[PDB]
Design a protein around this ligand. Structure first.
Ligand code: MG
Ligand code: MG
Ligand code: MG
Ligand code: MG
Ligand code: MG
Ligand code: MG
Ligand code: MG
Ligand code: MG
Ligand code: MG
Lengths: 157, 166, 247
RNA sequence: GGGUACGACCAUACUUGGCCGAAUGCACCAUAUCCCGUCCGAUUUGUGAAGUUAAGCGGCCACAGGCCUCGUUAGUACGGCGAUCAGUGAUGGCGCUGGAACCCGGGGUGUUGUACUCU
RNA sequence: GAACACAAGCGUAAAUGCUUGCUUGAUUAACGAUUUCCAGUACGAAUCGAGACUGCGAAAGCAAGGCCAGCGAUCCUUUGC
RNA sequence: AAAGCAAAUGAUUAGAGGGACCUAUUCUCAAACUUUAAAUGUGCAAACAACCCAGCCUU
């Protein structure tokens, strides 16, 4: 008899890591959130208030509303042949800032610096060279590998 | 060092009578007399058919004394036991105790109402500066060499008054 | 049987550093630094009061992730610069150091000309005007705000930590509080005695004890002027809060 | 080169023992008229300086435990895809490819922010 | 390695445990929004808010039951405003 | 999945050093055990109804 309660399979999902128990630290409290940001949803398992359902554990979305002790997040979820945008409300302890766009932002900054250097005449750093082309290989010595028949006696427990 | 000496911290008197009636009431009067200090009652923990007691029922009465009164009360007890003790009376912690059988012998005028009781004496000794293990803020542990051991306990005893039989 | 074997050390989880040293109560710390998420990291200030065996420390702290930032600290050992060189740990000393830090903070913010606070010293509750407690009007400029922090100290009627609070409030700072802990407060009638509070503020009790000590010294420096330089020190502090000992 | 107050990460910071500790400070420490609280000024609360580094604290050390990191275990165990593959079966290797864990060995034993400060 | 009414799992050490002091946030809460089952219907349970009056605290703050199982349409009867 | 019991919980064989007992080992295990931990998986992003830079207005 499986039962479909609110937490029906969360024995290992909602458990703290080894030698890592406790309540949230100060740095988590001073995070600050803004509408339009990307956040990850992960349950803390030490704060029972405002815990999301198990489906939304390890999911990323955009915050749409900020309250004194809560955050509202929009998360995609596939149903039958479509995907629904669900809105969930959680406490600020169960959300982390997402680094899913930091590579894209860094690339934009680099391109902006490229334009500024060109228009200011600054020399550009030299281009990296691929190693998949050819070249000369001069070895000091060459070894041989020929199945020296001691390995056959080796793999006997 | 001047403050490495051994002093008496407190002396605890305990009277463990059964029942929770007038016997307990009279025993409290006797203790508060000899102690000139309000005593407190104690309640049991389990229920034992053999001992005929129930859980959380008044059983014993005790008190603790610090200062000069502790010193003189200790002297009276040793006088009753003629300043003679045994080897197996000192703990490795650094404390020792004994027990009188008749409360009359301490020098208290007998009263035909209260009756005759026996008592337990326990003495705790320690150096100065143990508060580090009892203060609210920045609590730590006392140093090992600073702790009082059993061998120094009897030596302290013989110094003030000898008479230990091994 | 040995309980502290090798397996015991493998599974042990150490507590926070400042908890092992017995310095910080993190349960109270978390609630003290918490702020509404609707305010997007607007500064919030604390009033930290600590008392050692020889000194009283009052600091104004703003909490940050990289570490707490301290603005305008004050210590009771700078009092001899103003004319208090004895005791330095009684109720009178605690009031003086709280007043000094409030004036220093206000001067640095450039608001000392306003928000002068009370000048006549008396034990009276009054009330503190904050954004959530308009006390009537809400259009006048609001006073600088901070919340008191006492740490692991025991909160009892007549404690010296609240003496620092009263000095800061009279200095002009807005710290929310109630008169339930001032020494003249009686809980059965829920009333506060102004005369008792002002007597302890000016160190009346110390003078009586010192006088009595001299009498018992007979048949085994001078009282009656404590209010003298205590009032004089208050005026000196209100005059030049920024003066310090340079070297 | 250090101290104190408030911290961030939360063992390279913990546990046991030994040795040393210039100054500022931090402590242990003296005592109960008043505020306050206890069976007991032990803790707690209010007022002082009589003594001391004994302890706490800091620093160093230990064929010390633990913890952290790099190798080894090992291209081993296990896996995705393929066969009119082998084998009575149980199972197994092959082709294209991904790739562990403990034991064990070498090294290491806190980093750092704001303010007031001592040499 | 105890305890947290009860089945089990998760969680917790100056506490979510124990003792004690004071209390009635187990009230009202303008048809606010959302999760779970799911047809993205209802019922049950739960999460994040806004307003009134309060409780405990020196304060920051916590609390509109006891965390997650413990319950019920149309018609009819009956009570409150 | 694997691995481990020389690590917590549960089961379990035998010698040794100081008949129970203690210490360090040792044979052998786990769907309702686990410090560790794959392969195959699963969420988000990779530009115009947008992002920067500057100055400006309103609450
Ligand atoms: Mg599973
Ligand atoms: Mg997990
Ligand atoms: Mg508190
Ligand atoms: Mg085929
Ligand atoms: Mg508590
Ligand atoms: Mg329920
Ligand atoms: Mg409300
Ligand atoms: Mg609740
Ligand atoms: Mg397996």
């Amino acid at each position: 008899v499986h039962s479909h309660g609110y937490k029906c399979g969360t024995r290992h999902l909602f458990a703290k890591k080894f030698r890592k128990h406790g309540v949230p630290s100060v740095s988590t409290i001073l995070t600050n959130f803004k509408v339009g940001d990307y956040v990850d949803v992960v349950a803390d398992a030490a704060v029972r208030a405002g815990m999301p359902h198990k489906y939304y554990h390890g999911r990323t979305g955009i915050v749409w509303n900020v309250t004194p002790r809560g955050v509202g997040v929009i998360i995609n979820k596939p149903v039958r042949n479509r995907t629904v945008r669900k809105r969930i409300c959680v406490r600020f302890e169960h959300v982390r800032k997402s680094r899913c766009q930091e590579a894209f932002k860094q690339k934009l900054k680099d391109l902006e610096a490229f334009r500024a250097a060109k228009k200011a005449g600054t020399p550009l750093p030299p281009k990296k060279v691929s190693t998949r082309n050819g070249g000369f290989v001069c070895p000091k010595k060459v070894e041989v590998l020929a199945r020296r028949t001691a390995d056959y006696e080796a793999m006997i427990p | 060092n001047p403050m490495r000496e051994i002093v008496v911290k407190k002396l605890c008197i305990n009277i463990c009578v059964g029942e929770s009636g007038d016997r307990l009431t009279r025993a409290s009067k006797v203790l508060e007399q000899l102690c000139e200090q309000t005593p407190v009652l104690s309640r049991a923990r389990l229920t034992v058919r053999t001992f005929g007691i129930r859980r959380n029922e008044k059983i014993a009465v005790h008190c603790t004394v610090r200062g000069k009164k502790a010193e003189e009360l200790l002297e009276k007890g040793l006088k009753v036991k003629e300043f003679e003790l045994k080897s197996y009376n000192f703990s490795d912690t650094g404390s020792f105790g004994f027990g009188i059988s008749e409360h009359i012998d301490l020098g208290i005028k007998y009263d035909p109402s209260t009756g005759i009781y026996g008592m337990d004496f326990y003495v705790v000794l320690g150096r100065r500066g143990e508060r580090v293990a009892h203060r609210k803020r920045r609590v730590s542990r006392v140093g090992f060499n600073h702790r009082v051991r059993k061998e120094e306990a009897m030596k302290w005893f013989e110094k003030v008054h000898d008479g230990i039989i091994f | 049987k040995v309980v502290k074997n090798k397996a015991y050390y493998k599974r042990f989880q150490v507590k926070y550093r400042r908890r092992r040293e017995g310095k910080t109560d993190y349960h109270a710390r978390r609630r003290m630094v918490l702020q509404d998420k609707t305010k997007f990291g607007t500064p919030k200030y604390r009033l930290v009061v600590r008392i050692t065996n020889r000194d009283v420390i009052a600091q104004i702290v703003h909490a940050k992730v990289v570490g707490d930032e301290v603005v305008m600290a004050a210590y009771s050992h700078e009092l001899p610069l103003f004319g208090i060189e004895h005791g330095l740990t009684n109720y009178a000393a605690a009031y003086a150091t709280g007043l000094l830090v409030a004036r220093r903070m206000l001067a640095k913010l450039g608001l000392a000309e306003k928000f002068v606070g009370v000048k006549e010293v008396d034990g009276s509750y009054a009330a503190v005007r904050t954004k959530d407690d308009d006390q009537g009007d809400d259009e006048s400029r609001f006073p600088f705000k901070a919340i008191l922090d006492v740490g692991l100290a025991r909160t009892t009627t007549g404690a010296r930590v609240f003496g620092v609070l009263k000095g800061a409030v009279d200095g002009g700072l807005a710290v929310p509080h109630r008169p339930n802990r001032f020494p003249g407060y009686n809980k059965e009638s829920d009333a506060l005695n102004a005369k008792v509070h002002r007597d302890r503020i000016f160190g009346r009790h110390v003078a009586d004890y010192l006088k009595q000590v001299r009498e018992e010294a007979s048949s085994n420096v001078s009282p009656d002027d404590m209010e003298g330089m205590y009032k004089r020190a208050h005026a000196a502090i209100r005059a030049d809060p920024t003066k310090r000992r340079a070297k």
